[PDB]
Amino acid sequence: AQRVTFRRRNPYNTRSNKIKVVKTPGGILRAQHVKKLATRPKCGDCGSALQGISTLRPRQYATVSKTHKTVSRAYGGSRCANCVKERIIRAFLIEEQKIVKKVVKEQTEAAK
Amino acid sequence: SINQKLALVIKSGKYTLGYKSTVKSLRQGKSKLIIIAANTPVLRKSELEYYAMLSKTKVYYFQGGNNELGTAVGKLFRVGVVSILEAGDSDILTTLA
Amino acid sequence: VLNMLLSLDVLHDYDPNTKLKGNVSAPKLKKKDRVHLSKKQRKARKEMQQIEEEMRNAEQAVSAEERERNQSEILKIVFTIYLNILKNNAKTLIGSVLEGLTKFGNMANYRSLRLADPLNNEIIKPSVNVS
Amino acid sequence: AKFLKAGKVAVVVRGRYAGKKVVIVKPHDEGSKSHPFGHALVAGIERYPLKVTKKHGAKKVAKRTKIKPFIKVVNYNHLLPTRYTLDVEAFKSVVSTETFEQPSQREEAKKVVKKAFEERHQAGKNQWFFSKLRF
Amino acid sequence: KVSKSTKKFQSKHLKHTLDQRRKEKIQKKRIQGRRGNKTDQEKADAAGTREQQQLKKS
Ligand SMILES: [Zn+2]
């Protein structure tokens, strides 16, 4: 039933300073400031959370290996699997349509 | 009509409803005709068109949405594409439809 | 022919808060049914909305200040036409000229012989050009 | 007709080699005991050759034209078949169901496919197969 | 047991909230008996459409 308060300069209940109450090895209750939770990286096309990539603070990514923040597939770590599949299919079909349109133009200009 | 032929095919013939089944049957070469609803997404429609060109399967563009095509087939759910494995008793294949 | 000037909307003021036709539409796209936009795209959307709002305000002001000038010029032209008709003293145009003068006079500082009854004749009861 | 037969060029849409170009060597429509689905053995390009200009010479040209191959078992649902074809007569015997249960056979198959691909590229044939797809 | 937010609100904001509620009630009671307080929709209905006004003129 012991009351605890902030341990830093800020006296206001702002998002920046949030308090948890913990029992120290001295048998007493004491406050502890909690950091902001990390946010999962999101896909750049659909905005869904990327799978297989660890969730860390922006500056904590500078200290981990590349396998913990990428995926072995192309666009891995930036776009998800379904978006890459759509990109591949769309690019191939667009190229095929360009070929067909070029053949049609060649035929229609071949009359004269 | 075209709805009567489709209903007869579902009653007596062999069919596959849906995009995945249609593509699988196109790969296996067992499709005689693919009816495509007008409500289908453009990417899937273009993929089906390319697959039909590869497999030399006749294409019929249904004049209605996936729900109208589902009702024409006789099912209370939407179907986006139908593939006719066997006409059976009907004559949809004979009349170039 | 001369009766078409009676239909000039620019020479009409209606009640400031007139009821218009019933138009119903979604006030906004639902929050859970939005399309994903990149941070660059969202910033560009904010910028173009800010541009569009000020363009809308400026267009409103310009239309407001041009309607009055157009109304003045049209009043001058219409009154010149009416007065020159009156000076010409054409027996077949007196009623229309008087009706126009009565209608648009406050904006300033025989049915068998005519064809093609004026627009909205079912609701526009002629004040001066009666049968 | 059927279009997923030997020699048909396909584009992989799923997996590490997504977007890479492969050629089908042996289609299995009924699948296998270890792969109970309609799959195909394919030989594809993992590292496309780089373009060579007149400025490059000798050793540099030999470096740029190297091709890294790969051999894979791919489900049909993870392939996008093309209308193009490429001859697989050179290496239709090394890529089989057994090859993927013995790593040494995998090594030999990759060696053979690399040699065949480099020879075909240097012959000037199949310029579309040896070009990267931009997606 | 009273919640913390309830205690804080009742100690801080209860009095002026109640006073404002009373003020709105008094103003509503005073304005109810007066003439000339109509909403935008009500005034639009009263004025009517352009066709209704042209009928009223005729
Ligand atoms: Zn995505």
UniProtKB/Swiss-Prot annotation, chain B:
Its primary localisation, in coarse terms, equals: cytoplasm
InterPro entries per the record? Ribosomal_eL30-like, Ribosomal_eL30-like_sf, Ribosomal_eL30_CS, Ribosomal_eL8/eL30/eS12/Gad45
Example GO biological process:
rRNA processing
State whether keyword Metal-binding applies.
no
The UniProt keywords, alphabetically, are: Cytoplasm, Isopeptide bond, Ribonucleoprotein, Ribosomal protein, Ubl conjugation
Cross-link Glycyl lysine isopeptide (Lys-Gly) (interchain with G-Cter in ubiquitin) maps to: 14, 45, 75
Location within or outside the cell: Cytoplasm
Output the Gene Ontology terms for molecular function.
Answer: pre-mRNA 5'-splice site binding; RNA binding; structural constituent of ribosome
Tell me one Pfam family matched here: Ribosomal_L7Ae
Quote a single Gene Ontology cellular component term: cytoplasm
Can you tell me which family this protein belongs to?
Answer: Belongs to the eukaryotic ribosomal protein eL30 family.
Q: How does it assemble?
A: Component of the large ribosomal subunit (LSU). Mature yeast ribosomes consist of a small (40S) and a large (60S) subunit. The 40S small subunit contains 1 molecule of ribosomal RNA (18S rRNA) and 33 different proteins (encoded by 57 genes). The large 60S subunit contains 3 rRNA molecules (25S, 5.8S and 5S rRNA) and 46 different proteins (encoded by 81 genes).
Any miscellaneous information on file?
A: Present with 59300 molecules/cell in log phase SD medium.
Protein name, per record: Large ribosomal subunit protein eL30
User: Taxonomic lineage per UniProt?
Assistant: Eukaryota, Fungi, Dikarya, Ascomycota, Saccharomycotina
Curated annotation (Swiss-Prot), chain C:
What are the cysteine partners in each disulfide bond?
Answer: none
Q: Where in the cell is it found?
A: Nucleus, Nucleolus
Q: Which residues, by range, are in coiled-coil regions? A: 31-76
- Residues modified as Phosphoserine: 63
Q: Which domain of life is it from?
A: Eukaryota
Other facts noted in the record for this chain = Present with 11700 molecules/cell in log phase SD medium.
Give the function comment from the record.
Required for synthesis of 60S ribosomal subunits and the transport of pre-ribosomes from the nucleoplasm to the cytoplasm. Also required for initiation of DNA replication. May function downstream of the origin recognition complex (ORC complex) in the loading of CDC6 and the minichromosome maintenance complex (MCM complex) onto chromatin during the G1 phase of the cell cycle. Essential for growth.
Similarity field: Belongs to the CBF/MAK21 family.
Task: State the oligomer form and interacting partners.
Answer: Forms a heterodimer with NOC2. This complex may be associated with pre-ribosomal particles. Also interacts with MCM2, MCM5 and ORC1.
Q: What is this protein called?
A: Nucleolar complex-associated protein 3
UniProtKB/Swiss-Prot annotation, chain D:
Q: List the disulfide bonds.
A: none
**Domain of life of the native organism:** Eukaryota
The answer to whether UniProt assigns keyword Disulfide bond to this entry is: no
GO BP annotations, alphabetical order: cytoplasmic translation
One GO cellular component assignment for this chain's record is: cytosol
Q: Which SUPFAM superfamilies match?
A: Translation proteins SH3-like domain
Question: What PROSITE patterns does the annotation carry?
Answer: RIBOSOMAL_L27E (PS01107)
Assembly, in brief, is:
Component of the large ribosomal subunit (LSU). Mature yeast ribosomes consist of a small (40S) and a large (60S) subunit. The 40S small subunit contains 1 molecule of ribosomal RNA (18S rRNA) and 33 different proteins (encoded by 57 genes). The large 60S subunit contains 3 rRNA molecules (25S, 5.8S and 5S rRNA) and 46 different proteins (encoded by 81 genes).
Q: What does this protein do?
A: Component of the ribosome, a large ribonucleoprotein complex responsible for the synthesis of proteins in the cell. The small ribosomal subunit (SSU) binds messenger RNAs (mRNAs) and translates the encoded message by selecting cognate aminoacyl-transfer RNA (tRNA) molecules. The large subunit (LSU) contains the ribosomal catalytic site termed the peptidyl transferase center (PTC), which catalyzes the formation of peptide bonds, thereby polymerizing the amino acids delivered by tRNAs into a polypeptide chain.
Q: Which PANTHER family match?
A: 60S RIBOSOMAL PROTEIN L27
Q: Can you say what this protein is called? A: Large ribosomal subunit protein eL27A
The organism of origin for this protein: Saccharomyces cerevisiae (strain ATCC 204508 / S288c) (Baker's yeast)
Write the gene name.
RPL27A
UniProtKB/Swiss-Prot annotation, chain E:
Q: Where is this region: Disordered?
A: 1-58
How is this protein named in the record? Answer: Nucleolar complex protein 2
Function description: Involved in the intranuclear transport of ribosomal precursors.
Other facts:
Present with 29000 molecules/cell in log phase SD medium.
Entry's family note: Belongs to the NOC2 family.
Q: Where in the cell is it found?
A: Nucleus, Nucleolus
Composition bias, Basic residues: 1-15, 23-36
The coding gene here is: NOC2
Span of the entire protein shown here: 3 to 60 of 710
What lineage does the source organism belong to?
Eukaryota, Fungi, Dikarya, Ascomycota, Saccharomycotina
Assembly behavior: Interacts with MAK21/NOC1 and NOC3. Forms a nucleolar complex with MAK21 that binds to 90S and 66S pre-ribosomes, as well as a nuclear complex with NOC3 that binds to 66S pre-ribosomes.
